[PDB]
Design an enzyme around this catalytic site. Structure first.
Site, mmCIF file in Angstrom:
data_model
loop_
_atom_site.group_PDB
_atom_site.id
_atom_site.type_symbol
_atom_site.label_atom_id
_atom_site.label_comp_id
_atom_site.label_asym_id
_atom_site.label_seq_id
_atom_site.Cartn_x
_atom_site.Cartn_y
_atom_site.Cartn_z
ATOM 1 C CD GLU A 167 -40.828 -13.708 11.056
ATOM 2 O OE1 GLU A 167 -39.754 -13.845 10.661
ATOM 3 O OE2 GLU A 167 -42.255 -14.513 9.449
ATOM 4 C CG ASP B 76 -40.013 -20.988 19.032
ATOM 5 O OD1 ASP B 76 -39.941 -22.150 20.050
ATOM 6 O OD2 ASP B 76 -40.590 -21.090 17.912
#
Ligand SMILES: Cc1c(C#N)cccc1-c1cc(-c2ccn(Cc3cccc(C(C)(C)O)n3)c(=O)c2)nc(N)n1
Ligand SMILES: CC(C)CCC[C@@H](C)[C@H]1CC[C@H]2[C@@H]3CC=C4C[C@@H](O)CC[C@]4(C)[C@H]3CC[C@]12C
Ligand SMILES: CCCCCCCC/C=C/CCCCCCCC(=O)OC[C@H](O)CO
Ligand SMILES: CCCCCCCC/C=C/CCCCCCCC(=O)O
Ligand SMILES: CCCCCCCC/C=C/CCCCCCCC(=O)O
Ligand SMILES: CCCCCCCC/C=C\CCCCCCCC(=O)O
Ligand SMILES: CCCCCCCC/C=C\CCCCCCCC(=O)O
Ligand SMILES: CCCCCCCC/C=C\CCCCCCCC(=O)O
Ligand SMILES: CCCCCCCC/C=C\CCCCCCCC(=O)O
Ligand SMILES: CCCCCCCC/C=C\CCCCCCCC(=O)O
Ligand SMILES: CCCCCCCC/C=C\CCCCCCCC(=O)O
Ligand SMILES: CCCCCCCC/C=C\CCCCCCCC(=O)O
Ligand SMILES: CCCCCCCC/C=C\CCCCCCCC(=O)O
Ligand SMILES: CCCCCCCC/C=C\CCCCCCCC(=O)O
Ligand SMILES: CCCCCCCC/C=C\CCCCCCCC(=O)O
Ligand SMILES: CCCCCCCC/C=C\CCCCCCCC(=O)O
Ligand SMILES: CCCCCCCC/C=C\CCCCCCCC(=O)O
Ligand SMILES: CCCCCCCC/C=C\CCCCCCCC(=O)O
Ligand SMILES: CCCCCCCC/C=C\CCCCCCCC(=O)O
Ligand SMILES: CCCCCCCC/C=C\CCCCCCCC(=O)O
Ligand SMILES: CCCCCCCC/C=C\CCCCCCCC(=O)O
Ligand code: NA
Length: 448
Positions: free
Chosen positions: A209, A218
């Protein structure tokens, strides 16, 4: 047979191998799109400098070995041209080392920062600096601006007679060679240690991640930090910084340290572990799993949530029955695999083995090229340091007996040999280079 005839024959053979081998390097990069990355832009610049060693520097060395009479500025160019090619090699080796460092330190944001246009700009700048550094004696720092038996206006073209030793030691060796070589040693050491880092849950999801020490948006556009730690849905970075400062304990202005991100991630793991234990379907499996297989379960929870993992009723029961290989087959037949196969394959491998092998392998794949490139710097050091140390003895011990002629010949020839070794290293250690070499030789050279 004259000893001069042996020396010339050896130099000409090195010249031919340097040209042929390094032309093959540039030819391979020009032919193969798989070799047209930024790292090989500096490989080509390094290969160009070594070609010029065979075409010009080595012939220049043979002429100045006679100490013929020449004008000072013309003699300095014949003597100092190899200093330009050697300096360019250092800058290319330095660029390769740095390029590989940021490739393994920020593996996700490597392409956005390291671009072909920037690499070409650095190469052009470094070639300018190399001429400025190599030809510095031409600009006044020389010992022919003030040899008996040459006629006035000319000097005996001898390297140590015309190139000042304090230039060779202080400016060239210590500042322009030793410092970049030691920096390259620290960069590659830092690369090798990062590949040997201990693996844990923090590093497993760092690979899956990412790690960001600066606030970023994001896939939706929500402000995030560290390892996927959402800060706020608000469209205000100041609102995100307020949440970051509250969780960290200090004013951050949107930047944090690695330990602070690790602590923030440790709290996210504790929250995910508390949610797993509260779930009646996930708790019995988690309790049965070992520490590494529990990290793979936490990995899935961080990606799909506790409810999403709970939907794997068949795979979960085979995991609790320690039927690792059966659970792997089932998890591979899932939608989570089809959507993100790379992360899923690494998580599923963790379930099968109970080891961090899938994430260690990700680290080794990023550094295997670095070991081959690090060998090239070592061969550069091994080939040029003998001359630098001899220069230090002549400089710091003036009344010491000068190095004998045979060692001078060997040190000079060894320095020229460095222009031959790099294509042999690519051929032996880099498969994409070796394969392109074989195609060129079998098709374009041998015609069959
Ligand atoms: C250029 C350089 C770099 C770089 N980049 C880095 C460190 C040191 C040196 C460096 C080179 C020379 C030097 C002298 C002379 N020749 C011509 C030659 C060829 C064969 C035999 C001889 C004999 C023995 C007969 O002299 N000479 C050279 O090719 C090179 N000398 C010194 N002190 N340092
Ligand atoms: C990280 C390390 C290797 C860097 C040290 C720099 C080296 C290359 C330099 C710094 C000091 C230098 C020495 C200083 C004094 C002497 C004594 C003299 O009679 C001969 C040269 C000699 C022996 C020098 C050789 C080269 C030398 C050792
Ligand atoms: C990668 C490291 C290994 C590869 C590199 C190994 C070292 C370079 C090869 C050298 C032989 C040249 C040594 C002899 C120098 C020329 C011959 C000679 O000296 O003859 C002149 C005579 O002394 C008066 O005329
Ligand atoms: C026209 C020059 C192109 C190449 C000429 C043919 C070969 C010359 C030899 C150069 C030495 C190169 C060293 C590494 C290459 C190994 C060849 C291979 O991988 O099969
Ligand atoms: C100018 C002399 C010093 C240069 C020597 C090598 C330093 C550069 C190393 C190469 C890194 C690979 C390309 C990275 C581009 C940097 C991005 C940027 O800041 O523009
Ligand atoms: C690689 C193969 C290189 C082959 C030989 C290089 C040229 C040799 C010429 C010798 C001339 C020396 C002389 O007689 O002065
Ligand atoms: C000996 C000095 C001259 C030889 C060195 C230069 C020749 C080899 C250079 C690189 C080979 C691959 C690049 C060739 C580009 C061809 C351009 C084109 O055909 O469009
Ligand atoms: C002597 C002067 C030789 C100068 C260097 C040639 C230019 C550098 C080689 C091309 C690098 C750029 C690239 O391959 O993308
Ligand atoms: C005289 C010295 C010649 C210097 C180098 C010639 C080859 C330059 C390298 C360019 C190769 C082109 C490429 O493959 O990108
Ligand atoms: C790769 C191509 C290079 C070959 C062409 C250049 C020719 C070599 C240059 C000079 C040859 C020898 C001339 C000097 C004689 C030295 C003999 C002596 O030191 O007494
Ligand atoms: C493949 C091409 C190789 C070319 C090699 C050239 C060799 C150069 C040797 C020295 C010639 C120039 C130095 C002396 C001339 C200027 C000084 C003067 O005129 O007094
Ligand atoms: C190749 C061209 C590169 C620069 C050559 C510079 C020559 C230095 C001045 C010559 C001295 C003289 O006239 O003898
Ligand atoms: C691939 C071919 C490369 C072309 C470069 C040829 C190399 C020339 C060698 C040195 C020339 C410069 C040194 C002396 C210049 C002054 C000489 C004079 O004017 O009489
Ligand atoms: C005299 C000529 C000396 C070498 C010129 C090398 C610079 C041109 C090559 C550029 C290759 C490229 O990046 O496209
Ligand atoms: C009398 C000395 C003459 C000095 C000429 C050299 C000055 C120009 C500086 C470097 C020349 C080589 C150019 C290589 C940079 C281009 C590579 C690139 O842009 O990709
Ligand atoms: C032009 C690009 C940038 C150039 C800066 C770096 C290249 C080297 C430049 C000149 C260095 C001069 C060093 C002077 C030392 C003392 C001079 C002397 O004693 O005669
Ligand atoms: C690639 C790195 C380039 C760094 C260039 C700058 C470093 C310069 C450091 C000092 C070198 C000269 C120190 C003493 C000067 C010589 C004294 C003189 O003769 O006048
Ligand atoms: C790293 C760069 C080191 C540069 C030089 C350090 C020592 C400086 C001493 C200068 C001596 C002056 C002179 O050369 O006469
Ligand atoms: C002291 C000046 C700098 C010395 C060379 C600096 C470059 C160091 C880079 C790595 C060395 C070679 C790495 C290859 C690993 C081989 C495994 C081993 O020998 O232990
Ligand atoms: C004296 C020069 C020392 C250079 C070492 C710098 C540290 C290496 C690094 O961490 O990248
Ligand atoms: C290994 C490199 C050793 C360098 C040789 C320096 C010896 C000193 C001397 O002989 O005067
Ligand atoms: Na080189």
């Amino acid at each position: 047979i004259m000893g001069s005839s042996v020396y010339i024959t050896v130099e000409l053979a090195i010249a031919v191998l340097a040209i042929l081998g390094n032309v093959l390097v540039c030819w391979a990069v020009w032919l193969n799109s798989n070799l047209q990355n930024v790292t090989n832009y500096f490989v080509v610049s390094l290969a160009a400098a070594d070609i010029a060693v065979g075409v010009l520097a080595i012939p220049f060395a043979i002429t100045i070995s006679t100490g013929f009479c020449a004008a000072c500025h013309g003699c300095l160019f014949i003597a100092c041209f190899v200093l330009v090619l050697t300096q360019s090699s250092i800058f290319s080796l330095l660029a390769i080392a740095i390029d590989r460092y940021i490739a393994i330190r920020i593996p996700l944001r490597y392409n956005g920062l390291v671009t072909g246009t920037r690499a070409k700009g650095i190469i052009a700048i470094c070639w300018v600096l190399s001429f400025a550094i190599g030809l510095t004696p031409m600009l006044g720092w020389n010992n022919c601006g003030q040899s008996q038996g040459c006629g006035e206006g000319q000097v005996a073209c001898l390297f140590e007679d015309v190139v000042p030793m304090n230039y060779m030691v202080y400016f060239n060796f210590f500042a322009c060679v030793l410092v970049p070589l030691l920096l390259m040693l620290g960069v590659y050491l830092r690369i090798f240690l990062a590949a040997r880092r201990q693996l844990n849950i923090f590093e497993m999801l760092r690979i899956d991640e990412g790690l960001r020490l600066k606030i970023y948006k994001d896939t939706e556009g929500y402000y995030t930090i560290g390892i996927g730690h959402l800060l706020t849905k608000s469209p205000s970075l100041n609102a995100a910084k307020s949440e970051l400062d509250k969780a960290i304990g200090r004013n951050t202005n949107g930047v944090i340290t690695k330990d602070e991100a690790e602590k923030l991630f440790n709290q996210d793991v504790d929250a995910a572990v508390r949610g797993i234990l509260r779930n009646a379907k996930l708790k019995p499996v988690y309790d049965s799993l070992d520490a590494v297989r529990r990290a793979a379960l936490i990995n899935m929870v961080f990606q799909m949530g506790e409810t999403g993992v709970a939907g794997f009723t068949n795979s979960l029961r085979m995991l609790q029955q320690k039927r690792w290989d059966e659970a792997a087959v089932n998890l591979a037949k899932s939608r989570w695999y089809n959507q993100t196969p790379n992360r899923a394959k690494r998580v599923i491998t963790t379930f099968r083995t109970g080891t961090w092998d899938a994430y260690r392998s990700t680290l080794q794949k990023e550094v295997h090229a670095a070991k081959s490139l690090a060998i090239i710097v070592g061969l550069f050091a091994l080939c040029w340091l003998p001359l630098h140390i001899i220069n230090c003895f002549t400089f710091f011990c003036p009344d010491c007996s000068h190095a004998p002629l045979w060692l001078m010949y060997l040190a000079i020839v060894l320095s020229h040999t460095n222009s031959v070794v790099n294509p042999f290293i690519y051929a032996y250690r880099i498969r994409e280079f070796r394969q392109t070499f074989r195609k060129i030789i079998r098709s374009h050279v041998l015609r069959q």
